[PDB]
Amino acid sequence: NLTEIQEAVIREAVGKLDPTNTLWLDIEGPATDPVEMALFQPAGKQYIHCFRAMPGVLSYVIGLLPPDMVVTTQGSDDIRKLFDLHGRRDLKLVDVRLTSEQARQFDQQVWEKYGHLCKEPHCALLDCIMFQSVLDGKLYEEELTPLLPSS
Structure with a gap:
């Protein structure tokens, strides 16, 4: 159902993921019909990201994730x-279960730094960066390489 x-x-994008590093996954919308999906590896300064077909991409990505890998989410x-x-x-x-309040610690800084990748507002990719920042106790502000170019 995908070309x-x-x-x-x-396949090439997922292959660049390193299984020994933290990997965030966040989906926006219904699981079977996402509007957005994002995968983010802070240590490798890379992400996979795409918006609105979506169900095909999400299924194909899941099938390709490395064996026995740990996936980090905000609710799974x-x-x-x-x-x-x-x-x-x-x-x-x-599942990193930050409270609403906790998750906002770096919201504005993250939107300032990365808001162009998505342009109170929320998108899947920035949520992951925001949550990782809270865990790190400091703003994530590395240069990020997309692994999957908009088709």
Whole structure:
């Protein structure tokens, strides 16, 4: 349901992910029909990002994640269900459960620095950067390389 070109691009992007490093996954919208999905590796200063077909891309990405890898999210009740339905029971999930208040610690700085990648406002990619910043106790402000160019 994806063109072989799309599949080859996605495959190469996922292949550049390093399994030994933290990997964030965030989905905006219904699990079966996302509007946005983002994957973010702070240590490798890289991300995969795309908006509104989406279900095909998300499924293909899940199928390609490295074996037994730890995925970090801000809530994975449905992501767990998706993983499993796609034959990825081996993927491990961690939910970083910042309170609304905690998650806003670096909201404005992150929007200032990275808001152009998405342009009280929220997008999947920046949420991950914001949460990682809270964990680091300081603003994430590295230069980020997209791994997956807008098709």
